[PDB]
Amino acid sequence: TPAPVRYPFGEAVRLDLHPTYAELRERRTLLRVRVPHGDDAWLVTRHEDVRTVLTDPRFSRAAAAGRDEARLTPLVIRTSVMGVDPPDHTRLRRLVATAFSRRGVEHLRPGITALVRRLTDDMVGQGPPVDLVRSFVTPLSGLVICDLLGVPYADRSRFRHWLEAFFSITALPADEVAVRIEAMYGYIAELVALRRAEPTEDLLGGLVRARDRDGSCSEEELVDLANVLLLAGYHTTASQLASSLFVLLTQPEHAELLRSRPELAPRAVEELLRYVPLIAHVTFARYATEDVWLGGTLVRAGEAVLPAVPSANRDAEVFDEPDRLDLTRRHNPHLAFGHGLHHCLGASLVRVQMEVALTMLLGRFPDLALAAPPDEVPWTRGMQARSPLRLPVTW
Ligand code: HEM
Numbered sequence: 001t002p003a004p005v006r007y008p009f010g011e012a013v014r015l016d017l018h019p020t021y022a023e024l025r026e027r028r029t030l031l032r033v034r035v036p037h038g039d040d041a042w043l044v045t046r047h048e049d050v051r052t053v054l055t056d057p058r059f060s061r062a063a064a065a066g067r068d069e070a071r072l073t074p075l076v077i078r079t080s081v082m083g084v085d086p087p088d089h090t091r092l093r094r095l096v097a098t099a100f101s102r103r104g105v106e107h108l109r110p111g112i113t114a115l116v117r118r119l120t121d122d123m124v125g126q127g128p129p130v131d132l133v134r135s136f137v138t139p140l141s142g143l144v145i146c147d148l149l150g151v152p153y154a155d156r157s158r159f160r161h162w163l164e165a166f167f168s169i170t171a172l173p174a175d176e177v178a179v180r181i182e183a184m185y186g187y188i189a190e191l192v193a194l195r196r197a198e199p200t201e202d203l204l205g206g207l208v209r210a211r212d213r214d215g216s217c218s219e220e221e222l223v224d225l226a227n228v229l230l231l232a233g234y235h236t237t238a239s240q241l242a243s244s245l246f247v248l249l250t251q252p253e254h255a256e257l258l259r260s261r262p263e264l265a266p267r268a269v270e271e272l273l274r275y276v277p278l279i280a281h282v283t284f285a286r287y288a289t290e291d292v293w294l295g296g297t298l299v300r301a302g303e304a305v306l307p308a309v310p311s312a313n314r315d316a317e318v319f320d321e322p323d324r325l326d327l328t329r330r331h332n333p334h335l336a337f338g339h340g341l342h343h344c345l346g347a348s349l350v351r352v353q354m355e356v357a358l359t360m361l362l363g364r365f366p367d368l369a370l371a372a373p374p375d376e377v378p379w380t381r382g383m384q385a386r387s388p389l390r391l392p393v394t395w
């Protein structure tokens, strides 16, 4: 076992990838690394190999609960269906799958479309400049998940505070991170209480009923599913949307090609998920439950692998000219939503939310450009997902 390399390679800056990722794919070897917290790990950079760590049966995500899990975050996160294996993974996903399928999300399309129109109504009337994050990205992603889940979006001034603590690598101290985590779990319980006495028609009303009526999940399990879907919908989705809007505003002909022929939106959304390296560095660690040889390494039983999914999204044996954004790319087998068993549940909700939002922003604002130099756009740091802090625009 080699001397561990400090991981992450450094602060992930803007939408840039550190050069070591490209070196590692070509070497075809895993990098023994020492991460800021938890066990030592093997970094996985190749697409062909990150697929294996993300979904192979010999790689466990539940067995990471019995370890000081290799991570960037100070405290280990209860990750709901993300931190479990079958059978519990099947049992937990079965309760939210149909509402997050392609069909169920298509039923949501008029509301997202109607909301995007109401948000773009707001910008049209107010005039430039607009911070697209405050006035478009956050309300659309925030109102969408709050409505589907049943969270009052009108309490966001309260859970946005706790929400960020779940993305923190270095931005928050350990005690503020744990304090925020408990506060969010308490408020989520405040929401589940209301569904016992006052059932609701939303994702939240339906899953408490499965707990009380079917015993399909535990109370901690119920709170876990509710928490990760608010984290994912309210923040992870907005980060990808603000990042994708930043990409299109700084490479404006790609914005102009999508605008002039808008029927490229499904590929353009897929390409935007592939090209933007949303993950600051790696996704959740897996631990081998037996020996798996990959990346020139015999990963032994109990050893951690860290999936560098954005590096796998630039893999040249898989995507041609992968460092160049191609909104017209037809076959786009990227891993921005994961791969296999833990493939992103809100995969379709992001697609419908992204394709509807980019198209109308372009359709309604054809002259839209950044109001500050692309380097002057502030970005989040010490967080698990990349996003601009603001997106000042003009049109
Ligand atoms: C652009 C926005 C998003 C991106 C890029 C994204 C990305 C991902 C990725 C990469 C994974 C797999 C992690 C792994 O395999 O280790 C995943 C799984 C998951 N996603 Fe997302 N996500 C986004 C938004 C959402 C939304 C809106 C929801 C639901 C409201 C959601 C819910 C989930 C859940 C529950 C899992 C765990 C699924 C499982 O464990 O089987 N995500 N997501």
Ligand SMILES: CN[C@H](C(=O)N[C@H](CO)Cc1csc2ccccc12)C(C)C
Binding pocket: 077, 078, 079, 080, 082, 166, 167, 228, 231, 232, 236, 279, 283, 384, 385
């Ligand atoms: C796998 N999804 C990640 C995510 O949304 N991560 C967010 C912060 O890391 C929200 C989150 C915390 S636990 C958990 C469990 C399942 C889904 C989300 C979360 C992506 C950044 C790759």
